[PDB]
Amino acid sequence: DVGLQEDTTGEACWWTIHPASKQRSEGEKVRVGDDLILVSVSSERYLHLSYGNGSLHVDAAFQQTLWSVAPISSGSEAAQGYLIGGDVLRLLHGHMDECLTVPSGEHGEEQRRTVHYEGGAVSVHARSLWRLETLRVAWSGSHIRWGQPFRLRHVTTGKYLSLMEDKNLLLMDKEKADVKSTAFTFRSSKEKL
Amino acid sequence: LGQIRSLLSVRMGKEEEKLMIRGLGDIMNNKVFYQHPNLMRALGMHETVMEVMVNVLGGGESKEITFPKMVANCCRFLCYFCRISRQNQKAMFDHLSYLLENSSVGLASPAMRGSTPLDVAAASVMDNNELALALREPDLEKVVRYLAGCGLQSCQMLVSKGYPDIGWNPVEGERYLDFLRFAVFCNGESVEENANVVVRLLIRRPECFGPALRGEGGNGLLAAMEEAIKIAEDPSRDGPSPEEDDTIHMGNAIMTFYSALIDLLGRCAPEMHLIHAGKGEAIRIRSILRSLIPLGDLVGVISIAFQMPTIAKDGNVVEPDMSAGFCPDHKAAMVLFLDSVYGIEVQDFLLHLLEVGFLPDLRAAASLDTAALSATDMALALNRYLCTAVLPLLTRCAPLFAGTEHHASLIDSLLHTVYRLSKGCSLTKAQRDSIEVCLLSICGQLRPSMMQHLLRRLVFDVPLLNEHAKMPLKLLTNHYERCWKYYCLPGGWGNFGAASEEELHLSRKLFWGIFDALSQKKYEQELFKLALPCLSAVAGALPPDYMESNYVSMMEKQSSMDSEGNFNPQPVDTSNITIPEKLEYFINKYAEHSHDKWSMDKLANGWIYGEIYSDSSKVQPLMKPYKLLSEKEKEIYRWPIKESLKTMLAWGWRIERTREGDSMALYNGYSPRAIDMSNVTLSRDLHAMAEMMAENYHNIWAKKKKMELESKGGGNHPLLVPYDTLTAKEKAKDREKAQDILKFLQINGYAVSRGFKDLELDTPSIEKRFAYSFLQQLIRYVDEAHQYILEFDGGSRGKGEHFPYEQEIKFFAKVVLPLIDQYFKNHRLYFLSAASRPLCSGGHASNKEKEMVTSLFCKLGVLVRHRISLFGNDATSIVNCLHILGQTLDARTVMKTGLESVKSALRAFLDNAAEDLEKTMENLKQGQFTKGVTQIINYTTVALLPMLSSLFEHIGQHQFGEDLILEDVQVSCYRILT
Amino acid sequence: MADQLTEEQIAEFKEAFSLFDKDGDGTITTKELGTVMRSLGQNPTEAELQDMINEVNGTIDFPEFLTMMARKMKDTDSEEEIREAFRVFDKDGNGYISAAELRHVMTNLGEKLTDEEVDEMIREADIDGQVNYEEFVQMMTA
Amino acid sequence: QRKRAVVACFRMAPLYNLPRHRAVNLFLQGYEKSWIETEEHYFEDKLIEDLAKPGAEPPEEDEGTKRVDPLHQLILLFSRTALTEKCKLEEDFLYMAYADIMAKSCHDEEVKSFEEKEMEKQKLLYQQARLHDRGAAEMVLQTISASKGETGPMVAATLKLGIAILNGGNSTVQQKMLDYLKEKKDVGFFQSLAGLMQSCSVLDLNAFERQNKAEGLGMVTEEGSGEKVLQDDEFTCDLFRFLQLLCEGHNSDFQNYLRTQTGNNTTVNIIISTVDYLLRVQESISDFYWYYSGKDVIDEQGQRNFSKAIQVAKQVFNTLTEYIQGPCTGNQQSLAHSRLWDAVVGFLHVFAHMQMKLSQDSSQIELLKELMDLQKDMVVMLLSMLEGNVVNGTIGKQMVDMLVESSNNVEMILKFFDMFLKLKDLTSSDTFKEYDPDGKGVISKRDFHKAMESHKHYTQSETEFLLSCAETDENETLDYEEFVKRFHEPAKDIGFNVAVLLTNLSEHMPNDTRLQTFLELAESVLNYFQPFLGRIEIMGSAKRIERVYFEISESSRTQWEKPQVKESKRQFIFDVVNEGGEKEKMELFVNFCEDT
């Protein structure tokens, strides 16, 4: 089984990358667009995708499977600030006195799915945390530029922000977040340029 | 060679094939081919044969190999050429590559073993470290790919010949695995560089492991072996069914493939020294092998039993064909893998494996000890497998046998089976030596007290002093040398315990039997050199003041054992016993209890109620109250209890009527409810009762089954074995119903007791002591030795230098004297004990015992007087014995309470010493300037001085001079002083 | 038969086998399998014959036969392997080789191998330095 | 098997116990191996001269057409055999023997006179003319082409003969080879060269470890020494030496032809094939070094394996330098875009670590010398890459990127060089000469340590490292003359080349912060080499002003700065300024330079 380990001690946490084809070779610098085969140092198995169960699984097997590494983010990070994809943040609406959040004190998703501006300790509670997810898997940890579409996921409830005509803003689940209603953009100014 | 070289230039055909086969035969017949391998290599014969092979294989490469006889003969010639010399092997190694592509030329066709290009390739690297290390990864990769193809696709020619179309090719896979085994294992050591590569390639291609072990729905190795056995014993799936020849026995093929794979992996397993050092690659390989093969599968495969050869009517042996069924070589590989990868490091696992997988095989091999059945293929193969795989494993795992007090029955059965197998014939010298080493190490590690059954078995067998007696003799020597404190010391060895006087009587019988047999046996060098230490060790182990029980335990365990046959069931006759009427109440009550318990068990099984008495509708028992049961139904319960009571009375144990319980019970739809009874306790004597009477019942059943056997005309039922050799689970039923009957006796209170008592207390310790008897025999033998030496002095001086009593004198000089020396050196304090307490255990040898010690000392002195040259090198032995006896002499007590003849002999010893010293006086005087003089001088200087020195040192140390040296002995001492 | 057998003994194996001759296959069956070496001079027992038949179409030839005496070469290997040692060294014959004599017997001759001697004494060390040549050699000449 | 080896040693007997015929066979084999094979006689030059002599033309009475001489006929036969189409180049004993004979005839080989050197050069030219006047160059090209990329003794003999006829950079042979290739439009020759490079062997750790395991098992190889490690170093060196000799003398035409073959339908980049093999051998050397990095000492087999691998790598570096010098801009660009930088990075790591590892030992002096010679060759190749540079050039940018990638290793190398360059100054200081008052030249270890500590130029770690590098002596005394002659002199050459490289990079990348930081790291070496570094500007062959960097010796600087030479310079300047001419100014300057 392939899982997570707290400590780096031992060779179980180490994997060796090998080319999936003859175009690459040992010692050659790995390109971002490539297919790799990963071998566990401890067991000499492969990071393998198994079809045996009704649902696909991942396991360290002797049959080798091709894995493609996709970059997300790098060490640039634009120093401080400069919002990047995947960031968890608070949307301060007014003059540093309100946050976009949902009710939680009432309890119950039926009234927790609504969205509103609230002030006070909401700015330090986890209830007012939204993570910004880009629409592209590759380079999803890059800087967010003006007009770039994204989704806003309420971290605590796990539901995505969305717009429908009859009841304006609302949160739905992963199965109902269908980009047509959950996509939002940041604009420098409100004019319809 | 010129004929073959000329045939190179003509196209191959039938005539040329015949000519070249004959030429190769002539060459392999010639002397120079074997005497001068360098000449052969210089002439390049291997290259010529390889060119012929290439031509034949290329002819019809796509088709079947034309002229297979030519290929087989060339392969055989090249294999022999490789075997001739190492440089020939290295020269043929250069053609390894081509042979690897052409490996599959004739693998599937049988009767070509050792006559294939794969066989030539294997011989090119067999038992050669340089060539094994020179093997390359692509060379092993080709073989791995071929094995994967064999494991994935069936054999075309095999299926064309009508064989069932299984999905894989065990026949060729086995040969590929054998070649890989030769590649990875060389000269008894595993080439780690090749083993790692082979393991990595095999795990990269998991199809190489066959249907089973492939995963993804593949069943276990045990299941695969069982299914292959079913195929082997089921026709229409094993052969084609439209000298093996066409027959392949696909079940055996599958089994052999799996065995070869297991053997190859076990040889690829890393070394334990590397594992201990911590080579991460070694631990990784071991973990991989453990993941592939579970331990339980190996245990189950080992537990699988063979098919014993059967003796049928008219004395005909039916031995199932080895090449068609399950073979011990298949389990040998499993044992090898279990030892190499998993190993045996914990006592509980060792005992479990011994009980489930090894003990049945050992018992079967021991059972196959009949003269006719001991030469069968199964018997020889099983003996080879045992002595080459199983027994060395137990020898190496001997230290794990330390804390085995609980599983006494299991390892007693192990010891009995091993000893019987050793006694069996048709065993090679190496196999017998392996048996000896295994038994020695095992018995050395086990506890002294609980090998009593093996001691008892050896007692009846070793006095014969046959060729096989060497191993039991050494076994007894080592055991009694190690565990002497268990017997001699009254407290015992410690936590081990103390002898129960049964071991003491057994050891005394063994000692006396061995002594008598050696006395009457003609002198043999090795036999005596082995027997004397055994006799000394047994004498030292036995307490000197041991009291021999004049009455033996009634019907002691000699009836169960037999001469030669070693197993004659002897149930006690029940004809003359009459059951007392007072036991009828117990018979009735126990019948009621048994019927109620059986009704409970029947309802618990859940079977249709007994509403009528129906046979086919199978409603037989009626579960009706015992009082309502018929008299003939009562018989099936009463008769076993009747026989039980018959044996109880026959064995002389009283059962008396507890007054309280007897009066107590006398005044005291259907409910089958009975008594929870298993919670009752039994004493030690009660437990021994239950064990011996369950043994009698097992003997009864074994005898009945035996008469059934000769009624059928033959056979050997697996459990027809002595009760001691019978294992715990197999003794469980008899022991349980023993517990049942004794417990019901106890709960009724019916008091069972030993009954027949000792006829007399036997206070004459002075007469019945083991030391008393031993010293009587010793002094007697010294007396005949003395009379023989006077006969020699009478005869040899005239004419009789050679005397008829050579073997008697050799016995006395080789066995008697060292036995005396060792016995009195071990037990010096015992004979020297007196009113004072130099020893703390109690000792205190009798006055008569001390008297005979003195008499023996005097007899030995008289014997040695002027006869050192007659004994030659033994004179050292005589003087050592006299030294020890003089140290052990209890002069004060002997002179206070002793017999006049012995006292006079002790005085005469000193008088003779004084007279000899005076004679030496006149020999040295007036003879220093210029024969009996030399004899007296060297006799004095060699023997007389040490004896007097030791005796006087002992007397001075123990202050015996004030009690011994008085009057005439003072006069003799004055002469000695002058 | 890897050149360890000498020419004279190989020749007398052949002359015994040629006593029955017959084109290298005739009159040499399993019935004469014992008779040839019985005539040659040492006696094959049941163990010797089972060693002959252990790996053995059904009728032997000279390669197979002398291959059998290869594994029989394992016999009579007890006194001549130490005969050379007893001749060259151990003039006293005590077997307890002296201190300088033991330096000298492990004075490495050409191979110049190391750690093997110190391994032997860390695995086993005699006591009474004073290493026994007998105990020293049986460990390898088992 | 340990017991079996001892049993064989005990049972094995000397010669006098062996039967006479066996001992005679053994003696025959030994006599063949020791006396007949080692016997050598020289006949190649005489045989070639006899075969080249035209035979009796007044008897031939032809006078119309000169008949081909026997040597010409033999070369024609070999050429026809090569030209005949076959699946594989069959092994020909005749061709092997006569190719060896011809190569040795051309070869036929304490300061010697100039006329002696010229006489030797003329003799070599005549001997090579004896062959290439009869078709030897075309013959070797045809044989290489017919080899079809398969390594073998035929190809080895062909390469040796080509080297023999191309030694000294034979312009006539180079022109003949190029003309034949261009007029045949032979793609098989270049395909076979690429195949041979791909088939060339490298170091094999697995084979080395298996050989070590076998030797430790205890049975010595009855055959020759194990050549499984670095299979054919001689063949690889011969191939790359033939390639280098094909371009010696800055042969621009054939240098460009190797990179691209214009006429041919298919083109093979010999430049890229060479750099690929360089990368392979660099990786092998790195693996072999890593196998000893943990180990304290390097055995003899390892030392010889490094010697062979370093020789091969040095030959490849020389071949690449011959490729790019002249300069050849196309070759420079191809190597800049090739995998050369990765190999250079690996080599820099290997150098920066093995320098310390072998300098701390005393039994690896020759290995360290070979390694630093290889380092010097690599730096020379890098300088040739920078030859003909331009401001803000792509090659300079890539070299700066490589240096930044290998920053740590180059820093370690520079520290090594700085220590062993200050060694000479402390040796020549008066304090050291009073620590060793006599002129004997050997001083104790703590006298030496106290002398170092007196300077304070070194630190504690540097002093400890130099003491460790100092060899152990029974008298605890070291010879500082041999110490400096061992350690200082490889520096001041490799260090000077590195300083020239860094100065060139700095001057052609004036605005580069990474290079500025790298130079700040390398400040001390540049300060030491500043008086010895000479810069001039020339009107280069590419119609472009180019910087030229060279070495100025201390003796030259002192003689130039002597007052008499200064007065001569002043007089010359006065003359050219006043009565000199602007047309003849450079001629007068060159005459003054020659006289000075």
**CATH, residue C90:** 1.10.238.10
**Containing domain of residue C32, as a range?**
6-75
The C-alpha atoms of residue C53 and residue C31 are separated, in whole angstroms, by 12
CB neighbourhood size of D292 (10 A):
16
Those residues whose C-beta lies under 8 Å from the C-beta of residue B88, and which sit 6 or more positions away, are B37, B40, B41, B46, B81, B82
Which one of D209, D214, D222 has the shortest CB-CB distance to B129? D214
User: Experimental technique used?
Assistant: cryo-EM
- b/e burial code for range B811-847 (CB count within 10 A of at least 16 → b): bbbbbbbbbbbbbbbbbbbbbbbbeeeeeeeebbbbb
User: Do B31 and C61 count as a contact with CB atoms less than 8 A apart?
Assistant: no
What's the one-letter identity of residue B882?
A: L
Which chain B residues have any C-beta within 8 angstroms of a chain A C-beta? 200, 203-204, 206, 216, 280, 284, 287-288
Domain final position from C75, C104, C121? C75
Domain shared by C56 and C113, yes or no: no
Please list the residues that pair with A89 across neighbouring strands: A130
Chain A residue whose CA is closest to D339: A28
The C-alpha atoms of residue B583 and residue B658 are separated, in whole angstroms, by 12
Burial group, residue D398, by CB count within 10 angstroms (0-12, 13-18, 19+): middle
The C-alpha atoms of residue B253 and residue B259 are separated, in whole angstroms, by 10
With beta carbons under 8 A apart, name residues in chain D contacting C84: 10-11
**DSSP-based three-state secondary structure for A182:** coil
The C-alpha atoms of residue B580 and residue B645 are separated, in whole angstroms, by 10
The C-alpha atoms of residue B53 and residue B72 are separated, in whole angstroms, by 9
Chains C and A touch (3+ CB pairs under 8 A): no
The C-alpha atoms of residue A96 and residue A80 are separated, in whole angstroms, by 20
Domain shared by C26 and C62, yes or no: yes
Helices within D362-493 (DSSP H only):
365-386, 394-405, 407-428, 430-435, 445-455, 460-469, 480-487
Query: Which residue from B383, B300, B400 is spatially nearest to B347, judged by alpha carbons?
Result: B400
**Strand bridging mode A15-19 / A35-40:** antiparallel
The C-alpha atoms of residue B767 and residue B771 are separated, in whole angstroms, by 10
**Where on the phi/psi map is residue B180: left (φ > 0), alpha (ψ -120 to 50), or beta?**
alpha
The C-alpha atoms of residue C141 and residue D442 are separated, in whole angstroms, by 56
User: Do C24 and B80 count as a contact with CB atoms less than 8 A apart?
Assistant: no
User: Do C66 and B34 count as a contact with CB atoms less than 8 A apart?
Assistant: yes
B356 touches chain C (CB under 8 A): no
The H-or-E segment that residue D545 falls in is strand D545-551
Q: Is the dihedral of CA C20, C23, C27, C29 positive or negative?
A: positive
Number of C-alpha atoms within 13 angstroms, CB side, residue B562?
9
**Where on the phi/psi map is residue D229: left (φ > 0), alpha (ψ -120 to 50), or beta?**
beta
The C-alpha atoms of residue B103 and residue B115 are separated, in whole angstroms, by 11
Helices within B36-136 (DSSP H only):
37-43, 45-58, 68-84, 86-93, 96-101, 117-123, 129-134
Please list the residues that pair with A171 across neighbouring strands: A161
Chain C residue whose CA is closest to D13: C84
Give me B516's structure tokens: 């008598």
Q: Could you tell me how far CA D553 lies from the centroid of its own chain?
A: 25
Those residues whose C-beta lies under 8 Å from the C-beta of residue D143, and which sit 6 or more positions away, are D78, D82, D89, D95, D154, D155, D158
- b/e burial code for range B255-271 (CB count within 10 A of at least 16 → b): bbbbbbbbbbbbbbbbe
CB neighbourhood size of B973 (10 A):
19
What's the one-letter identity of residue B564?
A: E
Chain D residue whose CA is closest to C110: D220
Residue C53 counted as domain residue? yes
Q: Could you tell me how far CA B961 lies from the centroid of its own chain?
A: 56
Domain shared by C66 and C14, yes or no: yes
Residue C22 counted as domain residue? yes
User: Do B38 and D25 count as a contact with CB atoms less than 8 A apart?
Assistant: yes
The C-alpha atoms of residue B969 and residue B966 are separated, in whole angstroms, by 6
Query: Which residue from B112, B105, B68, B75 is spatially nearest to B245, judged by alpha carbons?
Result: B112
Asked if residues B593 and B744 have their Cβ atoms less than 8 Å apart, the reply is: yes
The C-alpha atoms of residue B806 and residue B570 are separated, in whole angstroms, by 44
User: Do B280 and A11 count as a contact with CB atoms less than 8 A apart?
Assistant: yes
Q: Is the dihedral of CA D278, D284, D286, D288 positive or negative?
A: negative
The C-alpha atoms of residue B622 and residue B629 are separated, in whole angstroms, by 9
Residue C84 counted as domain residue? yes
CA-atom Rg of chain D in angstroms: 29
At CA B503, angle to CA B497 and CA B509, rounded to 5?
A: 155
The C-alpha atoms of residue B251 and residue B261 are separated, in whole angstroms, by 16
Asked if residues B439 and B415 have their Cβ atoms less than 8 Å apart, the reply is: yes
Query: Which residue from D187, D306, D180, D162 is spatially nearest to D239, judged by alpha carbons?
Result: D162
Query: DSSP code of A68?
Result: E
Residue C47 counted as domain residue? yes
Please list the residues that pair with B769 across neighbouring strands: B547
The C-alpha atoms of residue B630 and residue B626 are separated, in whole angstroms, by 8
CB neighbourhood size of B723 (10 A):
21
Task: Say what the alpha-carbon torsion angle A168, A170, A175, A178 is, to the nearest 10 degrees.
Answer: 40
The H-or-E segment that residue B531 falls in is helix B525-541
The C-alpha atoms of residue B286 and residue D570 are separated, in whole angstroms, by 87
**Annotated binding site for Ca(2+): which residue ranges of C?**
21, 23, 25, 27, 32, 57, 59, 64, 90, 92, 94, 96, 101, 126, 128, 130, 135
Hunting for tokens 């030995």 — which residue is that? B860
**DSSP-based three-state secondary structure for D69:** coil
Domain shared by C57 and C100, yes or no: no
Residue C88 counted as domain residue? yes
What's the one-letter identity of residue C23?
A: D
Helices within B293-353 (DSSP H only):
295-303, 328-337, 347-353
**Annotated binding site: which residue ranges of C?**
21, 23, 25, 27, 32, 57, 59, 64, 90, 92, 94, 96, 101, 126, 128, 130, 135
With beta carbons under 8 A apart, name residues in chain B contacting C14: 31
Give CA separation, C106 vs A74, B47, C22, D8, in Å: 66, 44, 53, 16
Chosen for mutation from D22, D210, D222 (greatest number of chain B CBs closer than 10 Å) is D210
Hunting for tokens 């307890």 — which residue is that? C96
Those residues whose C-beta lies under 8 Å from the C-beta of residue D253, and which sit 6 or more positions away, are D178
Query: Which residue from B338, B339, B330 is spatially nearest to B361, judged by alpha carbons?
Result: B330
Asked if residues B926 and B933 have their Cβ atoms less than 8 Å apart, the reply is: no
Q: Could you tell me how far CA B956 lies from the centroid of its own chain?
A: 53
From the CA of D363, how many Å to the nearest CA of chain C?
20
At CA D575, angle to CA D572 and CA D578, rounded to 5?
A: 145
Domain final position from C58, C75, C92? C75
At CA B296, angle to CA B295 and CA B299, rounded to 5?
A: 90
Chains C and D touch (3+ CB pairs under 8 A): yes
Asked if residues B176 and B158 have their Cβ atoms less than 8 Å apart, the reply is: no
Domain shared by C56 and C24, yes or no: yes
Domain shared by C87 and C59, yes or no: no
Asked if residues B544 and B828 have their Cβ atoms less than 8 Å apart, the reply is: no
The C-alpha atoms of residue D109 and residue D107 are separated, in whole angstroms, by 5
Burial group, residue A24, by CB count within 10 angstroms (0-12, 13-18, 19+): middle
The H-or-E segment that residue A118 falls in is strand A116-118
174-193 in A: which are within 8 Å (CB) of B?
none
Domain shared by C106 and C133, yes or no: yes
Is the preceding peptide bond at D327 cis, omega within 30 degrees of 0? yes
Give me D356's structure tokens: 């310390």
Chain B residue whose CA is closest to C12: B31
Asked if residues B492 and B486 have their Cβ atoms less than 8 Å apart, the reply is: yes
Helices within B153-271 (DSSP H only):
156-160, 170-184, 192-204, 221-233, 250-268
What's the one-letter identity of residue B895?
A: M
Give me B89's structure tokens: 């092997």
Query: Which residue from B316, B333, B328, B335 is spatially nearest to B365, judged by alpha carbons?
Result: B328
User: Do A42 and B284 count as a contact with CB atoms less than 8 A apart?
Assistant: yes
The C-alpha atoms of residue B372 and residue B365 are separated, in whole angstroms, by 14
With beta carbons under 8 A apart, name residues in chain B contacting C123: none
Asked if residues D124 and D165 have their Cβ atoms less than 8 Å apart, the reply is: no
CB neighbourhood size of D172 (10 A):
14
Query: Which residue from B726, B733, B648, B643 is spatially nearest to B686, judged by alpha carbons?
Result: B648
Residue C109 counted as domain residue? yes
Number of C-alpha atoms within 13 angstroms, CB side, residue C119?
4
Query: DSSP code of D56?
Result: -
Which one of C7, C111, C142 has the shortest CB-CB distance to D3? C142
Ramachandran angles phi, psi of B116, nearest 5°: -130, 155
Domain shared by C27 and C86, yes or no: no
Q: Is the dihedral of CA D312, D317, D322, D328 positive or negative?
A: positive
CB neighbourhood size of B309 (10 A):
20
Domain shared by C36 and C90, yes or no: no
Which one of D25, D209, D219 has the shortest CB-CB distance to B129? D219
With beta carbons under 8 A apart, name residues in chain D contacting B129: 1, 214, 217, 219
Asked if residues B613 and B566 have their Cβ atoms less than 8 Å apart, the reply is: no
With beta carbons under 8 A apart, name residues in chain C contacting B78: none
CB neighbourhood size of B47 (10 A):
14
The C-alpha atoms of residue B314 and residue D3 are separated, in whole angstroms, by 54
Domain shared by C71 and C14, yes or no: yes
Query: DSSP code of D67?
Result: P
The C-alpha atoms of residue D504 and residue D387 are separated, in whole angstroms, by 9
Asked if residues B658 and B751 have their Cβ atoms less than 8 Å apart, the reply is: yes
From the CA of C111, how many Å to the nearest CA of chain D?
8
Domain shared by C67 and C94, yes or no: no
Q: Which chains lie within 8 Å of chain A at 3 or more CB pairs, if any? A: B, D
The C-alpha atoms of residue B220 and residue B297 are separated, in whole angstroms, by 7
Chains A and B touch (3+ CB pairs under 8 A): yes
The C-alpha atoms of residue D442 and residue D436 are separated, in whole angstroms, by 7
**Where on the phi/psi map is residue B822: left (φ > 0), alpha (ψ -120 to 50), or beta?**
alpha
Asked if residues B335 and B389 have their Cβ atoms less than 8 Å apart, the reply is: yes
Residue C1 counted as domain residue? no
Domain final position from C19, C50, C75? C75
From the CA of A6, how many Å to the nearest CA of chain B?
21
Domain shared by C83 and C60, yes or no: no
Helices within D12-69 (DSSP H only):
20-31, 44-52, 57-60
Query: DSSP code of D266?
Result: S
User: Do D1 and B133 count as a contact with CB atoms less than 8 A apart?
Assistant: no
Hunting for tokens 């076979």 — which residue is that? D192
What's the one-letter identity of residue C107?
A: T
The C-alpha atoms of residue D245 and residue D238 are separated, in whole angstroms, by 10
Count of domains observed in chain C? 2
Give CA separation, B755 vs B208, B554, B759, D328, in Å: 72, 12, 12, 121
Q: Could you tell me how far CA B768 lies from the centroid of its own chain?
A: 36
Ramachandran angles phi, psi of A19, nearest 5°: -65, 145
The H-or-E segment that residue B144 falls in is helix B137-152
CB neighbourhood size of B227 (10 A):
16
Residue C85 counted as domain residue? yes
Those residues whose C-beta lies under 8 Å from the C-beta of residue B440, and which sit 6 or more positions away, are B471, B474, B475, B478
User: Do A44 and B206 count as a contact with CB atoms less than 8 A apart?
Assistant: no
The C-alpha atoms of residue B76 and residue C64 are separated, in whole angstroms, by 10
